[PDB]
Design a protein around this ligand. Structure first.
Ligand SMILES: Nc1nc2c(ncn2[C@@H]2O[C@H](COP(=O)(O)OP(=O)(O)O)[C@@H](O)[C@H]2O)c(=O)[nH]1
Ligand SMILES: [Mg+2]
Ligand SMILES: [Mg+2]
Ligand SMILES: [Mg+2]
Ligand SMILES: [Mg+2]
Length: 192
């Protein structure tokens, strides 16, 4: 949401949210691997025993100058199993858009629903509803042999089909850029 006169940049924050081990890191790292060195900052991981945050910023090469001003995307996620809520609540501060990385595993179906309820709860602390922020659903791990039907996964996190849904196999980069383009489209629309 930030404007930075000094370096001539507007800054958008994109949060990858979802149950633990759904593929959030993997999305971030695939993306970070295809950005040229000169257009990205460092990928940074801050951790305690119980908590983690991982983030980087980059200048997408797909985006026009809004009157001399470049666009910088900052991608944030709370990777790993989650022990406390505090890093997931904080991750959402000043969020512009969110990718929800759902796990296609039968035994993570409940974890999907749980993380979505939690995102909704954390958003509510900032006075925001699920209608107030662009949210895209990525159904990741479509390669698993017992991958649930996409419609089933979608049904527990988005029963009225309010959000765009994309399939992914983040370990192979599949769906990864298309998911980032989708949230990008919605965030940049709101801007202009
Ligand atoms: N089979 C499969 N494994 C995946 C996929 N995406 C991520 N993983 C694996 O899932 C585990 C958790 O992924 P990670 O990105 O670290 O999770 P997160 O950051 O906690 O959401 C890792 O072992 C990944 O290799 C996928 O599309 N298919
Ligand atoms: Mg996590
Ligand atoms: Mg950076
Ligand atoms: Mg599932
Ligand atoms: Mg809410």
């Amino acid at each position: 949401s930030t404007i930075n006169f000094a370096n001539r940049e507007i800054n958008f924050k994109i949060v990858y949210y979802g149950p633990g081990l759904s593929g959030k890191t993997t999305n971030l790292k695939w993306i970070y691997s295809k950005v040229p060195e000169g257009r990205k900052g460092e990928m940074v991981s801050l951790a305690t025993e119980d908590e983690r945050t991982l983030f980087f910023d980059f200048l997408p090469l797909d985006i026009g100058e809004v009157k001399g001003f470049k666009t910088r995307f900052h991608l944030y996620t709370v990777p790993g199993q989650v022990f406390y809520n505090a890093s997931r609540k904080l991750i959402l501060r000043g969020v512009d858009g969110i990718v929800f990385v759902a796990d296609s595993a039968p035994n993570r179906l409940r974890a999907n629903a749980e993380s979505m309820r939690n995102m909704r709860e954390n958003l509510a602390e900032y006075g925001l509803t699920l209608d107030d922020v662009p949210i895209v659903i990525q159904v990741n791990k479509r390669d698993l042999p017992d991958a649930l039907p996409v419609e089933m996964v979608r049904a527990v996190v988005d029963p009225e089909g309010k959000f765009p849904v994309l399939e992914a196999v983040a370990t192979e980069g599949k769906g990864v850029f298309e998911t980032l383009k989708e949230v990008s489209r919605l965030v940049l629309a709101r801007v202009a």
